[PDB]
Design a protein around this ligand. Sequence first.
Ligand SMILES: Nc1ncnc2c1ncn2[C@@H]1O[C@H](COP(=O)(O)O)[C@@H](O)[C@H]1O
Ligand SMILES: Nc1ncnc2c1ncn2[C@@H]1O[C@H](COP(=O)(O)O)[C@@H](O)[C@H]1O
Ligand SMILES: [Mn+2]
Ligand SMILES: [Mn+2]
Ligand SMILES: [Mn+2]
Ligand SMILES: [Mn+2]
Ligand SMILES: [Mn+2]
Ligand SMILES: [Mn+2]
Ligand SMILES: [Mn+2]
Ligand SMILES: [Mn+2]
Ligand SMILES: [Mn+2]
Lengths: 340, 344
Amino acid sequence: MYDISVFIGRFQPFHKGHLHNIIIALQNSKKVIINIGSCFNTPNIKNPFSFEQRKQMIESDLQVAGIDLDTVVIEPLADYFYQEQKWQDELRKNVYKHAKNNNSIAIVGSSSYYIRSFPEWDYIGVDNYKNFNATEFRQKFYNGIISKQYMCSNDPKLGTYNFLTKFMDTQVYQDLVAENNYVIEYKRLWLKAPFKPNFVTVDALVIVNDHILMVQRKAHPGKDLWALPGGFLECDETIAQAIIRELFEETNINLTHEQLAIAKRCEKVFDYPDRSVRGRTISHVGLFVFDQWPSLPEINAADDAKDVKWISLGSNIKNICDRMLEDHYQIITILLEECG
Amino acid sequence: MYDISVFIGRFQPFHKGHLHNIIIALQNSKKVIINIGSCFNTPNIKNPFSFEQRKQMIESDLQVAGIDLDTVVIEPLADYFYQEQKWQDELRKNVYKHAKNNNSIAIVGHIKDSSSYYIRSFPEWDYIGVDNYKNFNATEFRQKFYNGIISKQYMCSNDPKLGTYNFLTKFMDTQVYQDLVAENNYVIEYKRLWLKAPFKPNFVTVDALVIVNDHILMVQRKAHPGKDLWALPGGFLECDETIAQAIIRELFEETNINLTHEQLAIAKRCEKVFDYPDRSVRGRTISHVGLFVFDQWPSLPEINAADDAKDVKWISLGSNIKNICDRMLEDHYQIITILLEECG
Ligand SMILES: Nc1ncnc2c1ncn2[C@@H]1O[C@H](COP(=O)(O)O)[C@@H](O)[C@H]1O
Ligand SMILES: Nc1ncnc2c1ncn2[C@@H]1O[C@H](COP(=O)(O)O)[C@@H](O)[C@H]1O
Ligand SMILES: [Mn+2]
Ligand SMILES: [Mn+2]
Ligand SMILES: [Mn+2]
Ligand SMILES: [Mn+2]
Ligand SMILES: [Mn+2]
Ligand SMILES: [Mn+2]
Ligand SMILES: [Mn+2]
Ligand SMILES: [Mn+2]
Ligand SMILES: [Mn+2]
């Protein structure tokens, strides 16, 4: 009937619930565009696999009962938690790429967001079976258990099953297990709270001669990832004070607090509920700009930073965009745009 | 030696440590100007007494001491947690209401914490460092006071019939006292729940300042802290919502304002963060507010009190707002002032 079905998911991992929904869409349309959300990030516990691995996983799963691969296309989406129009444009870009000859288009499926966001397209609704829970799957996986009832295949050499089986031997699997054990122990310790906690953190975006100051993380979450210098707000300091305290603790930047105060452009809040794996963490980020300086200030890593670097804007920043903590690539992008 | 000395305190309440320091100020100057900090706020456990009450208390203790009251003047200072320049000027306005045409002026504060601040902000005035062994604990005194005990070693007067000591004896029979004790018990219990947590909490709240035809929407509080006070509508941020959503969710819950989500999204001017660490008695609470401006609107939307709001009212700017200025929750007066200047 439709020329095109639009299908959006995380696929962390791809399962039978996904295969049956694609199948409903392929008997309602001639071609499916599968849009994988949350790409171009480093692996974390909620997002273990890359775009390429998930794309592969999907293809080799579809290639087993049935399915014509000529009727299927796969495109990536980045996260834009604070700039939803960008996300919308990017999805529209992915679709216009495959449907620009007045093709008939429907979104197969956050059912209300897609209905509000995309009036141009029809919404094919799908209620599934027993709740295929991606968290439950992943938590058993970091415990050594692939749940074969989720798997498209039954053969451990076929599909996601084979990918998941082999993945358990990788270094990335270990890192993720380590991160997950950290978070379980961290979350446990906080069940004491009379009320579920919001964490308040601070970060500093410091630009000197078109370089951004970044820290490589010594500890979980995001161990060995690059990040803005920052950490927890303390009960006795203002946000503005915490921003500078963490900056100096982690990087020992050779600037005075007065200089940084003159260089300060703004402070923004980042409050996407799932930005961090510890629990709900709101970050206040200060932007500091030195259009020019005789040189890059001296920096020395300390505390939870195992390294610190001045990294130039443009290509060098883009090249570590998938080696950064949490939403820090978005934060950098936003603050330089609007503050700026 | 100096014509004027300048002395700043909260005096919640005035005590022997304060007296001690005013005696030094007067060995070094001919007139001392006493500035009472945190004036014009409603009574809270940390600030139980009004400006007038503290003034009375100081005058009566200085008679007991007995310092000639012609050598003493008393002026109020409001709080400006977020507008440090309004405070510096307001002080200067206090000092020069009294010092005139080439008086030598000294500030007499603690050589320890607030030494730095006064040196920098008031270079025109000299400094007289004070502080002596004693460790007079303001908090320690109020806690015992909320348990029914006036600590004698704090009292300038040994006689319960006189001075601050008398004032506090009589104050203990009032309803305000009873409301302070109740707030205190609430706060002690609130904090007890949190003693176990691996880290001290920073609490996150939201408020909405909604202005329709120069009227602020304000709730009157059902629960602690600041019971029976007027506040911007607001409350705790939940874990599964953004701050933008929280601000609107709490607005509806407390006021049932007859406006739509898109109508408020259009009316929204800005959000501001309020993070003075001692702004709330519960523990460290940061607030994100929430400015919404409706101009030349056909009518004031319909509202009704629910959840922790027991009343809700449209309050016109200007006269009716300064009227309840000392009847507001925590720093909401300051928050309203700031959001009107910088966003509206
Ligand atoms: N919820 C929390 N509140 C305050 N401090 C914390 C919290 N969780 C961890 N920390 C401390 O902060 C350290 C990490 O550095 P940073 O995140 O830069 O402040 C950890 O090693 C903890 O000791
Ligand atoms: N730390 C907290 N986090 C979330 N909700 C809370 C917290 N403390 C108190 N509350 C709830 O908020 C109520 C008061 O309403 P509100 O302050 O307007 O959200 C109390 O009755 C509590 O149920
Ligand atoms: Mn290994
Ligand atoms: Mn840190
Ligand atoms: Mn820290
Ligand atoms: Mn740190
Ligand atoms: Mn370089
Ligand atoms: Mn409330
Ligand atoms: Mn409420
Ligand atoms: Mn609430
Ligand atoms: Mn009116």
